[PDB]
Amino acid sequence: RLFAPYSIFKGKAALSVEPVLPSFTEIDSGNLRIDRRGSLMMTFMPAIGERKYDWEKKQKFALSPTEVGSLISMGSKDSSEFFHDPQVRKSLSVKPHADGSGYFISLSVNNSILKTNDYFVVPVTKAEFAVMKTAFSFALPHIMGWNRLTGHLE
Amino acid sequence: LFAPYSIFKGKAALSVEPVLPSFTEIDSGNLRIDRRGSLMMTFMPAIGERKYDWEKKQKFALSPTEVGSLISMGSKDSSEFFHDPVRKSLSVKPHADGSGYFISLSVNNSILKTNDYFVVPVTKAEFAVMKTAFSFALPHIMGWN
Amino acid sequence: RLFAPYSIFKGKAALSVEPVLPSFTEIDSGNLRIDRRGSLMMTFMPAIGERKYDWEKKQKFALSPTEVGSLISMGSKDSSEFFHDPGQVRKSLSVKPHADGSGYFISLSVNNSILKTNDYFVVPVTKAEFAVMKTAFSFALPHIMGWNRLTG
Amino acid sequence: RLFAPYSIFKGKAALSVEPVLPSFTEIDSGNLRIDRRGSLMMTFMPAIGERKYDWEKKQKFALSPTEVGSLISMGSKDSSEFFHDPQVRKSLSVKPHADGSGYFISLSVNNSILKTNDYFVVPVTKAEFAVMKTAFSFALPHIMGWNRLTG
DSSP states (O other), rough: BBBBEEEEOSSSEEEEEEEEOEEEEEEEEEEEEEOOOOOEEEEEEEEEETTTEEEEOOOOEOOOHHHHHHHHOTTTTTEEEEOOOOOEEEEEEEETTTTSSSSEEEEEEETTTEEEEEEEEEEEEEEHHHHHHHHHHHHHHHHOOOSSTOOOOO | OOOOOOEEOOOOOEEEEEEEEEEEEEEGTEEEEEOEEEEEEEEEEEEEEEOOOOGGOEEEOOOHHHHHHHTTTTTTTEEEEEOOOOOEEEEEOOOOOEEEEEEEEEEEETTTEEEEEEEEEHHHHHHHHHHHHHHHHHHHHTTTO | OSSSSEEESSSSSEEEEEEEOEEEOGGGGGGEEEOOOOHHHOOOOEEEEEEEEEEGEEEEEOHHHHHOOOOOOOOTTEEEEEOOOOOEEEEEEEEEEEETTSSSEEEEEEETTTTOOOEEEEEEEEHHHHHHHHEEEEEEEEHHTTGGGGGG | EEEEEEEOOOOEEEEEEEEEEOEEEEEEOOEEEEEOOOEEEEEEEESSTTBBBBBTEEEEEEOHHHHHHHHHHHOOOEEEEEEOOOOEEEEEEEOOOOOSSSEEEEEEEEEETEEEEEEEEEEEHHHHHHHHHHHHHHHHHHTTHHHHHHH
């Protein structure tokens, strides 16, 4: 595995984004296989002070191709909100600042079972969101499988 | 084979996937025949809630120029493509509020005297996937990759 | 071939476009640099009749990366015009929009000698066709700049 | 190894731009991570009269992916300004002409150690900036290492 997330580190939280290509991976001598669907994976972690973050407390939100399209389609005055009920319930919000200078990206996680509620917010500048739209656009066909790695091409 | 991008709606479903250029050699072979790519749209009618009839699927292949038409569409634009002679046409018409489009396929069989209309709403997000995927595919279907 | 030309065939002329990659030369230290720049080669040829074109009369115009930039950045109300001059004669290429925003007309002017009337080849290009051009040209731009070689 | 800058030569200076890829290094368990970040390298040099430039007095400014995003997202009336500390202070500005015909791109280098400073200004046309935006957009996922993820 190569890791190359695009990461943004801010006051209350950090956000890392990275494509997940569809894959089927053997481990444990072949007894177990890990099947991953194509997505754009967003990972949030909370700040703990002195400019550091708690990796062990990270929470994720996986964007489908359609959800990626939602983000790519946003201009400076647009919003997106996504709800995943995979009893853990997650909400991702991308909301623009009034001056068009960027967005708050937040993730809300509700665990009815453990009675917990977690919230992570990261501001993203216009420049940072431009990186996301460009990189996400690049990655989208690959997450959809439109290539030689996943496509059945010789 | 590529996994299609599919949209499943109330009355019909739409799937889209690229078809690469293919080549064959003839005349010994002094002629190389290069078959242009397309973006293939496949429509199926609903038979229940989120159920569709695969046996009744209908295809519409977009040329590079027709793909250009779609990628160039803003939130207030329309496109309509006519293929003939069976006779088919494809329209992309915007919702007044700018939140998406209807993408609709008309199929007229003159043999059997039927006219079938497959209508699929597409959200802004879903059309953005198409525009991005199609823009990616366009150089490949043109043979510029 | 590496690039199959995109062609548009219309009433008075036809237009074909294809990338030409840059050449490299090794210099000192085993290092390689661009020798001759890449371009987007546009080939125009006039109509002789009913969708038939005179290939013997083809004329070419090589767009530089910067000129390709000019085209890709055009909106529906913009025009572009490029003038080339130091075997090679003076040529100019223009892209002008129809007032209704439905598309453009692309014109190549070839200035011949004082004994020879100039040649003018004009090809209308619809919004859809120009979208194919901008998309394909954007794709080709880093290749004609040699940037694809700076990566995988 | 192979060099392929996009270069703009103007009255007072020239600008060359070129991507620099990240490097990936193996860690534990066969996994690879980025040990050197990618950038978009901007190289400025001074005009020395005639139509020539002092290729040996070049000065550089390395844009991060985020700084590349700043430029890609600029419209004809937008500005960008970046401040770097590698004291050697450097600032890069991209400021629009009022008529929307292009920009000035300038590099300021404040050399506190040598107690000097340099200044390069390169006008860029709309077309030239469009090349930059398109080429930078192409290069961005490569400088971020995402081409390696997607294969």
